[PDB]
Nucleic acid binder design. Structure first.
Lengths: 168, 104
RNA sequence: GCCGCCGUAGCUUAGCUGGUGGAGCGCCGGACUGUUAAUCCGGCGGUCCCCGGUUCGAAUCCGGGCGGCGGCGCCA
RNA sequence: AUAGGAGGGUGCGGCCCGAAAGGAAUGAGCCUCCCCGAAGGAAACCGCGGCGACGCGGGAGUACGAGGGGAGGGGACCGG
RNA sequence: GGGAAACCGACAUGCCCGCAGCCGGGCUUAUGCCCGGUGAGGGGCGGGGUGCGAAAGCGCCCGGAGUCACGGCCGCGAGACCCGAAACCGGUCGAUCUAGCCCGGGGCAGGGUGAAGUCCCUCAACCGAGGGAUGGAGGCCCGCUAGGGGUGCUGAUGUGCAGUUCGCUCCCGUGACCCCGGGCUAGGGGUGAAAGGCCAAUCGAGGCCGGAGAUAGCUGGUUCCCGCCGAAUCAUCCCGCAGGAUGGCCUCCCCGGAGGUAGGCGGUGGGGUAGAGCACUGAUUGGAGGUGCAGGGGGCGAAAGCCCCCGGCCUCCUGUCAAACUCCGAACCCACCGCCGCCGUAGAUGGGGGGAGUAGGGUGGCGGUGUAAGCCGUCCACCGAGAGGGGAACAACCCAGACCGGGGUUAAGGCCCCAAAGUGCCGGCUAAGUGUUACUCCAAAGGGUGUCCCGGGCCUUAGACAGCGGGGAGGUAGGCUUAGAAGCAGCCAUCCUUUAAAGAGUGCGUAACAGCUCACCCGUCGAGGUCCGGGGCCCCGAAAAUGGACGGGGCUCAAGC
RNA sequence: CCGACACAGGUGCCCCUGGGUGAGAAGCCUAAGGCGUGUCGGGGGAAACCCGGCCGAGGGAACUCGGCAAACUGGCCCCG
RNA sequence: CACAGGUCCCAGCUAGCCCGAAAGGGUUUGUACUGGGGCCGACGCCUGCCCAGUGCCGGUAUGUGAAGCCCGGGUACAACCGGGUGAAGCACCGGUAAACGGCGGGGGUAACUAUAACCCUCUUAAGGUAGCGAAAUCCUUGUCGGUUAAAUGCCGACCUGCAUGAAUGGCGUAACGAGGUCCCCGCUGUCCCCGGCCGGGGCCCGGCGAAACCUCUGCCUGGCGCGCAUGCCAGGGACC
RNA sequence: CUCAGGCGGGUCAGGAAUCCGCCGUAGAGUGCAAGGGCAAAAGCCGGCCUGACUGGACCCGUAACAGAGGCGGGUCCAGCCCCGAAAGGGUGGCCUAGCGAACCCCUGUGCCUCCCCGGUGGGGGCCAGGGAUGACAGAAAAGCUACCCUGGGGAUAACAGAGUCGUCUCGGGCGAGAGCCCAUAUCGACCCCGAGGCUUGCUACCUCGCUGUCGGCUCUUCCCAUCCUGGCCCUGCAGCAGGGGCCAAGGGUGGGGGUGUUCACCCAUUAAAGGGGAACGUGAGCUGGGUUUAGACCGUCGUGAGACAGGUCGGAUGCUAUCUACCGGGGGUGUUGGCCGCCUGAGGGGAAGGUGCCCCUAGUACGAGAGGAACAGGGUGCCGCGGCCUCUGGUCUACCG
């Protein structure tokens, strides 16, 4: 996994449709819902995306984990409900090249520069809900902290922030 | 695409001005050749002169170590601006013996 | 990273037009033998590597995947 | 013999000349008065606004103005 | 004239438009105009000839203009605007260089070693043993003899002394040696102790002459001026992509002759890209409620049992979003008409004929690929091939499309000096010399009780905002866990009583009863207060190589933003 | 002579037994014989630098791909 | 490279091989102890195994195999059509590797951990033998040892050789070499670290007198620009 | 005439084929990719039938617009059939892939023709079908060249530069977790964002009428993200010694052993033995070992020629400075009429100095002990640097033996 310098843009086009193309990659995310059902709470905090991006399957799993881990330890899974709504669908492409030097290329311009699948990504526009956590007002302070931690691993930035829905 | 001035080349060497610091004044007297007292010199000058210098007969000074210049050149003497301080000056240094052989 | 080719009884190998499945080896139960070896009858397990698809049905024919075999990895 | 570069073009000083092929003594460089005059176009000064910078009306399409005509003085070069 | 040939054989005009002109009327002072005939030239039918053809239907042709001459443009063949190489081939000429072969001659200081061969003495029957002599061989040694070679110095030279040299050092130096003269072998041939070496300053096939002005899609060059118009660097085909041809396009001449439709409005049509979403094709994320079912785990299992059970297969309200999905669907492009506009009778629009040119770049938009720069499409101002003015300079950013000379006024952009023009004006930001750079010139997430300004809450003598004086309950050591977990590893419950007030406890402290302390609270001082959340701007983040620089200086209530 | 040049090149013989030397047609010196036209001179005690060459303490290849270059040994007699 | 030595091959001279347009010719005043052609390259010890493939050679009933002739047909003749006859050649058989060349893979197993003397299997003719080997072996500075204080070296050894091996010669070798590499002793300006000297140049004068090459010129730095500038742009230095 | 699939009844272990009813706008099917078309059909079933017929056109595609061959198709009309009651349809398969020339030969039919003329054989020709060029608008066609040669090209590789920055280096944020309790003394996953241009790769902008390769040597400048030195902060900082961070380029940053080696490995020292840029600094300076000539060998490959970034021995390093650059040296002008001598000091340069050791402190502070500082005051050593030759070395072509 190369550094993200292509997952930070949406000016790159679509190549989602896994059935259509020969060769598709696996996921890394399996777990998306955690805690109690979302009908046992009143208030809704979201993290809102203010920038268009593509968010990597790797970043989604990492960000969720570090967050969910903090919520689980302090609060317990007897309280809160946390969801990261998105599934990544956008397939990502690679030009083959590694060190080999000397007379060797590696390479290569064309001769099939066309992707082998790296991964998957989720397309996040402006005012989307990247995270939605459900809480009570006892459990407010934990949900905000967790969201702050999310935002760094967001490919660009937030500018709409940590948002009180309030729960309408 | 130039030549620096710090790269080694031929040109003048010598006939350059130099100030060398902290040379001890061994001695002052006048003559030379004979003095009637036996301490603070007994009097100088090798016989046969020196190679490339005339007769010494007038007031003189004998200074420690190297003096910058050629034989027969005018030298001027400058008091020190400050001398060592980890090594004190001590007045009239004790002169055990003076040469009397020629440089040749 | 490229381009060929495999995997089939515990092992090694035949085989396939898509309607099949063996051999030698090991192993197991009897039998010669005093016992045993050798020898000698009786056997069996195979999704014919994973995973899609077409078909009325795929071990076989195409897609993909995995491990193992060769051949280029250079005049530049 | 303190001063910047495709070695020049364009415009103007200094010095230099120019009899000859050019215009000019039947008047050159030059001076001065008057008028006509395309496009353009003020000021002083007056009154009133504008927080201010500054603007309007009148002066006034006047003064001025490329370009054109007449007269007049001086007296030798002017272009090149 | 048609047909391959056999072979056959046509309109000196039947019909209709209409340009020019003629003829007529109307009209304007006139030219000129509007409308009706007549209409050569021209345009459109019919009928005709012939070929194919049972036939039909087309193909080609049909109501008389060409020939010759002169100049020039252009194509092709020729040397073919000019020059330019490596070849190939044919006939010739070299072995005074050099290679080997042959005849006949010659050269090579000195020194060493010491074979065979031969001899003798002493000692032994013999076998032999010891010693010495003599002789003199060698593709032999030493050797800067002459002579031959040429290893190292990578030295000297390296426009030399020299187009292959010099000195020291070094190899050979009676030989498979060197050398002279004569003589032999010649170019796909010789010769080669064989390196593709050598065969006369020329050898992976010598030289000379001729073919020969070879031919090259390839490099270079192609010469007087002026005026007018003024490109394409695309497409299809190609042993073709460094080239041709043919179109688009550019330009020139001629012809016919009344419209033509770049722009905009409306009408009538075409359409699945933006966007959007569950409506399909249909990929996928997540948990409830149906318990409609194909089966891998368990149970009273008396045994596929009656009965429930758990991956799960698929309805439902819901749950993520989908180049190559679509219930839908813009802006927008495009066909035709009408209208207006515009353009034309100083002839457009269309037709025929002569001449080319088939490396692109580039900002931006929209892309496709690609981490990117770049590549490749597409439209695109523009550069090519277009100055001038401005962006410091700067192919393509901005302004602008340029006959000469003059007067004037603005554009772009700028008004602190350089350098024309503002020490402009109002208000606000700024303390970084941020910036003074739309450019080709322009660095981020994160983050600052740094400022300035909008929000709606809390809340104010029912005054904690900070200080300050006193605080800091009981079950309970919560239990588990565990040595201990006694608020204070960790897990989970996190409740109940009593009130300044009290968290199954904030940090310290023991590893774990304790101790210090907090949230908290009445409260003194007697107020305008604490929050949180958007925004502008400035700060941190922010290190680079000969000199650092916003163009420079320098600027800080500006000459900045 | 030949190499375009009066080219440090390179082409045969003969004098190969001159004297001294010493194994010697060797070196050096020297005789007969030849020449001072291996054809440009002079100056600076002549510095840097370059070619030939001489000498370097102490250390004894640490240099460098490498003891390359250079040095050392040295003739002859005896022992072995 | 030659080379002596070794081997394979061919030819009965009216030969073989080779030259020549031809006549004719070389070897050859030669005759198998000849003379022609290859391979290997002194000596010492040796030279395994394969004829599947290539090549060469000998032979070939049979099939097959041209033109000619023959027969049939056709044509008034001819072209023409068909069959037999069909030589070398091919298919076919054998020999032949000091001819060109080849000379393999997996698994399982031993008092104990290791390995496997051991045993299976199959291609394609045969299955690497005597030897030698990390090489004039990739990985790689293998590993161990010698050697150096310290050595990606050298040398010795092991050896599983990425990709050795027997006349496309293997191994080993006294003597020999202006051959490649390594060590030791002496020695030594190669070096630490350079100096001084000497002679010829340099440098000046007198006389004599060329060439290479030639848009121009007093810059430096940055920026820009065909992206590696004296000349554009902005600074600075600047008398010849 | 209407289907996949699903439901309920039937048979079976289940299930199949088979059976009955109900739902069911297309999920079926239509040869075959894909897409498009279609439900009283083009699908399904059954019967009949053979138009995938002959001739000759228009038009379109091919090849938009816009020239363009072969090929295909729609669409007429004539002729001959077919089917259907008829209308009416049939120019092959619902559409879009299944494509093939000049010339030649063979086929088939009818017709022309073969040199004075007739007849016969055997020819030519008009037309159509069929036989190949899959490199598919059709040549008849294997390799090597480091022995090369030529025409050219930076329209295009190697090298260096520029651009870029995946990789590379470095840096930042978040903070899962470990460190005795304690995220942040220290260590730090997942993930995310930047800077540089020092490795590699991408690019083809520059250069192919030659900007000479590496490495080394020698010589000099610069950069800091700093190895030491100086001045500092934190600490799981007792000391002494570390770890981690800041400031800082003034100075220093070595010698050897292997390798062609930049790198790297090792030895012994050292305060420390930092990294990177300058045509991967440095060939009109050297060196020329290595890379990539022409000789040769081995291994592999190849029939062979012959090849190899496989291994290996050997393999030349040109030039008299016109301009400019600097080091040094002259001759003169300008500084306002000239001159002889002495000064000032705008400015320019610098490292002239760097660094270590030892003694005293002190066997002290601190420490259980082992061990063991500092301030301050002295002495020295080395490296760099400038002068000097008396001492002592070197030389000394004065000279003497």
């Amino acid at each position: 996994l190369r550094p993200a310098k292509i997952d930070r843009y949406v000016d790159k086009p679509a190549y989602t449709r896994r059935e259509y193309i020969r060769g598709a990659p696996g996921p890394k995310i399996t777990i998306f819902d955690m805690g109690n059902p979302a009908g046992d709470f009143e208030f809704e905090v979201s993290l809102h995306t203010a920038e268009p991006v593509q968010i990597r399957q790797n970043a989604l799993e990492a960000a969720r984990q570090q967050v969910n881990r903090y919520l689980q330890k302090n609060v317990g899974r007897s309280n809160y409900h946390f969801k990261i709504r998105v599934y990544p669908f956008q397939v990502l492409r690679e030009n083959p090249m590694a060190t080999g030097r000397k007379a060797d290329r590696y390479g290569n311009g064309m001769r099939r520069p066309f992707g082998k699948p790296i991964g998957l990504a989720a397309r996040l526009k402006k005012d989307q809900k990247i995270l939605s956590i459900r809480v009570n007002r006892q459990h407010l302070k934990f949900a905000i902290e967790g969201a702050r931690r999310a935002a760094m691993k967001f490919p660009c930035k937030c500018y709409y922030r940590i948002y009180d829905k309030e729960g309408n | 695409a130039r030549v620096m001035w710090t790269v080694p080349m031929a040109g003048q060497m010598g006939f350059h001005h130099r100030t060398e610091l902290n040379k001890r004044l061994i001695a002052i007297g006048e003559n030379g050749k004979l003095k009637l007292d036996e301490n603070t010199e007994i009097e100088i000058t090798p016989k046969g002169g020196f190679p490339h210098y005339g007769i010494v007969r007038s007031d003189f000074m004998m200074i420690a170590g190297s003096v910058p210049g050629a034989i027969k050149r005018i030298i001027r003497v400058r008091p020190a601006i400050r001398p060592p301080k980890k090594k004190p000056p001590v007045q009239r240094p004790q002169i055990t013996y003076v040469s009397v052989e020629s440089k040749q």
